[PDB]
């Protein structure tokens, strides 16, 4: 009776964990299974993902106030200050649901399991530090300059992710080897600083210990290759050997050695991911069998017990009916153990359909339309005219570019876009009159084409509403959206399937890796804000300086301007210029910030990218 | 009698080919085995390697005459012209030995084998083209401007190499995939040229079709990251998304996709090298057995036939005596087939010894010296004082650097180098009085230390000959060679053995890969000479130009100046500057030269380097 239905709840949650690749380490109770099924719903996990985005969105609208139009410092309508109410209200509202998340994760798990698992403990210490810092900054009227609780926000992203925790373990195992090459590189520098200072001080680059040390470090990433050697090379031809050897040993051996060291841990990444997925499903159904085999009882599981459990699970109805027919094909025989486990190998099949088309009333009208629809040249007529559209934009952009930027003719340009757009409407209306409103939605390219067509006629008819033949801005907007038609010529990839297959495989696997970049940007922005917030003031310079070039838009005055400035240091070109400017404005101890940013971003993460491309390329063969 | 000894010659050359991993496809004759053993000697292969270096050295002393001190064009003592005699004499003397090489390679191989093997045919066509071009340039008095026979010289390097022929086959199999990503990248460019020209011409970078096409191509290799976007970024913050997406799709996906495509062919490089080595030794001894088993005869090979053949082979005497004792341990029994093949597994063992030390006459004198020699702290006392030497050079280079460059004290600097050098002499003289003149040579570090010590005392005593205490140049030369002592602290690599093991493994495997770089430089230099030989003349510039910077040393006027100029384009930094200069001086069709040089050098070869590091790292585990 009661233990009858109680075993049913242990049946349904063990099947559901066996599908979704979860573990079985939660305590089994009566209403906890009401909570377990509800906490893992679609609605609950999507609220938790939305609030994580919210606090990581919130730094755009904090007191540095990145709501302007230009980030340039020489002219900017600066202020938009929100008051002390709303931003600290939405800060504490997200802290409630994370506190609600921790409570139901610890209550549903073991209490002793809570004290052992390090991530739940770190989830707890971050919450109280964020709450103490909230009430302290609320006691004062917002006039605390630096907000330490803003740094702890990316731990909420790292907690609920299951792919970043794998990737952080792989870079933790690579760490004692990366410190050795980092040690060997620092030996390699300070040798050539001493060896350089004998040759050249006996150059504006070699006049001091920290100046020559900086000049070699920037050469190590090859940001000044010709410019650091041209005094010495103009004195003698033989001085080229000193700089050639330094970048061969430095940039070629030791930087590419860091890539091979990181890839040595990611070598079995996807295959060992699939193995622990299948291993968790093996003990999933086995514990489901073991509790169902001992419901009331030889050793077997009654199919009438199966009839109620496989209904209450949440699954695709394709695999659901296949389970249901296969147990109905079985008799009243008690199901064996090996036949129980191999029964759940229906979840490896995948079925792809699109839709069935629909007929008409009049028989010669329907048979002519559908048999010129099943043609394979109908889309090729669309592909031909779209290419004919694109060369027209091509020839007309280059013809008006060179001469007469003010007053161009643009007479035939209107008529060309008319005949193409009304061609685009008639084909998609003939498609839906040959497939159906359901028959047209089943293709993802047709959603892409059908949405793009109905937008362009709105743009065209609006130009046709005010002109007959804001002219230039509408034609520029109309020309821009015609260019996006070229993305529909792309997916006909017949001989180069190895490229499009991995690009899909890459973006399906950048939950972890895109997440790590977000963690690193968000930390280094807020550190960079509090150090260089008001350092650059713009009120006759050397010809290669920060001020001869107009690099004034690259500062750390807000969140949007920090991200682009950190981007331009990540692509390592011309970061000798930023090093000289931030020395001249904020003292020479700022170089430890940029060098540390150079090590995390360019060295570690862009090697981390190449290890993940290499793994996801070499897969299934 | 005659066929008795004739089988002995077929025995010895089949064993020798089985050792040195050669093939058996040469015709077996009487005096051809006299030629086969002599052509493959140590002296013959080393003459062929020296003449290959000679013609590839010869371009330094041709008519562009790269014998100056500076390559700067604004001042240079230009001319040194050798006459028409000697350079065309040494050109034709190397052509004789290559013609002698082709003849004995074809005569010893099959005649029909000659017409099938493509490399021997290409060896023949290159020889007659080089000889026709020699006699044509000799008929005229050297006044032919361009020498087409100079381009065919790297085929002589490619012919006699057995590792470059493997590597060229691996990049030939990768070619139809690299053309697809090259196709997909060209689609990716010309979309954003049209999309860029609508947004920004509606910037000095976006004013034309070939100007905007060049600006995106240089952004693709990130050579102008901040400088190409700062007008648009200073107009609006939202224009950063256009350039961020272009370098994420461009540089991160598609360039790193080219590395993964190349590495997909080098994935089994070293293991499939070892397999075809062992496979050639398997059929080597088997054909040696098969001719020896049918000398006069159950089925076996008489050991008295073995006694004469294993003497006449050339081998290490360590494995030679081990073969000889093992056949002497065998009786007069006819040796079986399986026991014949497993007999030659002595060639897998390797024995390392150094030397035995020698005693003295007087027993308390020898026993005290050798037992404080077997100490392991004797070298640690050398390691301590060498570190104490290096901090002295460290502290004294930084102290005199900042102030007073003219007249420094340098009083204690002499005395510091005295006590260290005479320490260095007494330790190596106590080492040879505890090891021996033979006992000291057996260590490669002691050869390195012993040579460095005897040089520094010559430098020190020469300063002591003219001073007592050209001063500064001698102390600068003395300080420089003390820095090289730090290379002896390095080889005590206890916890990071994975780094030093592969660095040895890399340089033992760059016969192929260093050879390909030589082929690519040598071709692209001589093409670049004949196009831009006298284009730059130096007789108030924009502040970032080729002439504001003093880049005048980077031209193509000779062979030494071409190599450094091609080097500074290989490391891709600031190659926007070279593109603008060579447009302004030699017309706009010069950009096809540098773009083609960008594709071969940076894209292919530096991806080729990272594939070879990755293979030689992941080896034996």
DSSP B4-59: HHHHHHHHHHHHHHHHTT----S---STHHHHHHHHTSHHHHHHHHHHHHHHTTGG
Q: Where does residue B373 rank: exposed (0-12), middle (13-18), buried (19+ CB within 10 A)?
A: middle
Report the alpha-carbon distance of residue A558 to residue B613 in Å, rounded: 42
**From the CA of A280, how many Å to the nearest CA of chain B?**
29
Q: Search chain A and give the residue with CA nearest B618.
A: A264
Residue A234 has its nearest CB partner, among B550, B614, B617, at B550
- In contact, A600 and A566? CB cutoff 8 Å: no
Sole residue written with tokens 């970048």: A247
Give one word for A185, left, alpha or beta, with left for phi > 0 and alpha for psi -120 to 50. Answer: alpha
The partner residue sitting opposite A548, judged by closest CB among B259, B506, B543, is B543
From which experimental method does this structure derive?
Answer: cryo-EM
DSSP state at residue A226: S
For residues B478 and B414, give the distance between their C-alpha atoms in angstroms, rounded to a whole number. Answer: 10
Of B187, B568, B573, the CB nearest to A223: B573
Residue A231 in tokens: 């005094």
* Tokens of residue B154, six digits: 């790297």
Q: Can you give the length of chain B in residues?
A: 621
Burial class (CB within 10 angstroms; exposed 0-12, middle 13-18, buried 19+) of A214: buried
Burial tier of A346 (Cβ tally within 10 Å: 0-12, 13-18, 19+): middle
Chain A residues with CB inside 8 Å of B264's CB? 617-618
Distance CA A154, CA B526 (A): 56
| Shortest Cα–Cα distance, B153 to chain A (Å) | 25
DSSP reduced 3-state for B301: strand
CA distance A279 to chain B (A): 26
CA–CA gap between residue B544 and residue A549 (Å, rounded) = 9
- Å between B254 CA and nearest CA of chain A: 10
Give phi and psi for A153, each to the nearest 5. -60, -40
A345 DSSP assignment: G
Q: Can you give the C-alpha Rg of chain A in angstroms?
A: 32
SS3 of A301, please?
strand
Query: How far is the C-alpha of B158 from the C-alpha of B123, rounded, in Å?
Result: 10
> How many other CB atoms are found less than 10 A from the CB of residue A316?
12
Resolution rounded to one decimal, in angstroms:
3.5
Mutate: best of A194, A261, A386, A501, partner B, most B CBs <10 A? A194
Instruction: Measure the CA–CA gap between A313 and A324, rounded to whole angstroms.
Output: 12
CA-CA-CA-CA dihedral for B280, B284, B285, B286, to nearest 10? 100
Rounded to whole angstroms, how far apart are CA atoms B61 and A65?
A: 66
Do residues A574 and A110 make contact, with C-beta atoms less than 8 angstroms apart? Answer: no
Report the residue from A72, A486, A617 with minimal CB separation from B234: A72
Give the integer Cα–Cα distance in Å for A336 and A618.
40
Residues 6 or more apart whose CB falls under 8 angstroms from that of A225 comprise A219, A247, B568, B571, B573, B574
CB contact under 8 A, A573 and B251: no
Q: How many CB atoms lie under 10 A from the CB of residue A564?
A: 19
- Distance CA(A499)–CA(B331), nearest Å, equals 65
The end-to-end CA distance of chain B, in Å, is 53
**Contact between B202 and A251 using a beta-carbon 8 Å cutoff:** no
**HSE-CB for A213 with a 13 A CA cutoff:** 12
Residues of A in contact with B226 (CB under 8 A): 549, 551, 554, 568, 573-574
Alpha-carbon dihedral B402, B407, B410, B414, rounded to 10 degrees:
130
Q: Which letter, b or e, does each residue of B327-359 get, where b requires 16 or more Cβ atoms within 10 Å of its Cβ?
A: beeeeeeebbeeebeebbeeeeeeeeeeeeeee
How many Å apart are CA A206 and CA A219, to the nearest integer?
13
Yes or no, beta carbons of A184 and B234 under 8 Å apart: no
Go through chain B and list every residue after which a break occurs, taking a C to next N gap over 2.5 angstroms, comma-separated. Answer: 202, 297, 469, 539
Classify B550 as helix, strand or coil: coil
Q: Give the residue from chain B lying closest to A197, CA to CA.
A: B397
Tokens of A135: 């009430």
The partner residue sitting opposite B568, judged by closest CB among A183, A197, A225, is A225
Tokens at residue B214, please? Answer: 């060049």
| B227·A397 Cβ contact <8 A | no
Closest Cα of chain A to B418: distance in Å? 20
CA A342 remoteness from chain centre: 37
Helix axes of A164-173 and A269-293: crossing angle, nearest 10 degrees: 130
**Distance between CA atoms of B294 and A66, rounded to whole angstroms?**
92
């Amino acid at each position: 009776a009661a233990r009858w239905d109680l075993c049913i709840d242990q049946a349904v949650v063990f099947i559901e964990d066996a599908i979704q690749y979860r573990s079985i380490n939660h305590r089994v109770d009566a209403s906890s299974m009401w909570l377990y099924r509800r906490y893992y719903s679609n609605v609950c996990q999507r609220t938790l993902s939305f609030t994580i985005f919210l606090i990581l969105f919130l730094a755009f609208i904090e007191t540095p106030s990145s709501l302007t139009s230009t980030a340039d410092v020489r002219y900017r309508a600066a202020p938009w200050e929100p008051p002390c109410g709303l931003t600290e209200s939405v800060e504490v509202l997200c802290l409630l649901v994370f506190a609600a998340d921790l409570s139901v994760k610890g209550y549903l798990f073991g209490w002793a399991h809570f004290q052992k698992n390090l991530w739940l403990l770190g989830y707890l210490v971050v919450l109280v530090v964020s709450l103490v810092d909230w009430t302290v900054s609320l006691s004062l009227v917002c006039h605390e300059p630096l907000r330490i609780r803003r740094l702890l926000r990316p731990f909420f992203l790292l907690q609920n992710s299951s792919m970043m925790k794998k990737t952080l373990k792989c870079i933790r195992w690579s760490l004692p080897e990366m410190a050795s090459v980092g040690l060997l590189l620092a030996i390699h520098l300070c040798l050539f600083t001493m060896f350089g200072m004998l040759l050249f001080a006996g150059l504006t680059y070699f006049q001091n210990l920290p100046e020559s040390l900086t000049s070699l470090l920037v050469l190590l990433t090859t940001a000044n290759n010709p410019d650091v050697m041209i005094p010495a090379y103009s004195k003698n031809r033989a001085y080229a050997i000193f700089f050639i050897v330094f970048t061969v040993i430095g940039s070629l051996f030791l930087m590419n050695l860091l890539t091979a060291i990181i890839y040595s841990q990611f070598r079995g990444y996807l295959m060992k991911s699939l193995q622990t997925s299948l291993f968790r499903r093996r003990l999933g159904t086995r514990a489901a069998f073991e509790v169902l085999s001992s419901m009331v009882g030889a050793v077997g599981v009654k199919p009438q017990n199966l009839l109620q459990v496989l209904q209450k699970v949440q699954l695709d109805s394709s695999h659901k009916q296949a389970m249901m027919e296969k147990v109905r094909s079985y008799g009243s025989v008690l199901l064996s153990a090996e036949e129980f486990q191999k029964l759940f190998n229906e979840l490896d099949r995948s079925v792809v359909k699109e839709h069935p088309p629909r007929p008409e009333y009049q028989s010669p009208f329907l048979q002519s339309a559908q048999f010129l629809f099943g043609h394979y040249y109908f889309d090729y007529l669309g592909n031909l005219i779209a290419l004919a559209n694109l060369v027209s934009i091509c020839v007309f952009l280059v013809l008006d570019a060179d001469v007469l930027p003010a007053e161009r003719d643009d007479f035939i340009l209107g008529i060309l876009n008319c005949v193409f757009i009304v061609y685009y409407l008639l084909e998609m209306l003939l498609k839906v009159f040959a497939l159906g409103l359901r028959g047209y939605l089943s293709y993802p390219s047709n959603v892409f084409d059908g949405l793009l067509t109905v937008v362009l006629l709105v743009l065209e008819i609006s130009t046709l509403a005010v002109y007959r033949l804001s002219l230039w801005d509408m034609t520029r907007m109309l020309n821009m959206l015609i260019v996006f038609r070229f993305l529909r010529i792309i997916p006909s990839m017949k001989p180069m399937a190895v490229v499009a297959s991995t690009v899909l495989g890459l973006v399906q696997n950048m939950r972890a890796f895109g997440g790590i970049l977000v963690v690193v940007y968000y930390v280094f922005a807020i550190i960079g804000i509090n150090l260089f917030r008001g350092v650059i003031v713009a009120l006759s310079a050397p010809c290669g300086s920060f001020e001869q070039l107009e690099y004034w838009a690259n500062n750390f005055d807000d969140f949007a301007a920090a991200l682009v400035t950190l981007w331009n240091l990540m692509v390592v070109n011309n970061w000798q210029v930023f090093l000289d400017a931030y020395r001249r404005y904020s003292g020479p101890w700022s170089k430890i910030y940029f060098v540390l940013w150079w090590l995390v971003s360019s060295v570690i993460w862009v090697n981390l990218f190449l290890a993940l491309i290499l793994e996801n390329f070499l897969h299934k063969w």
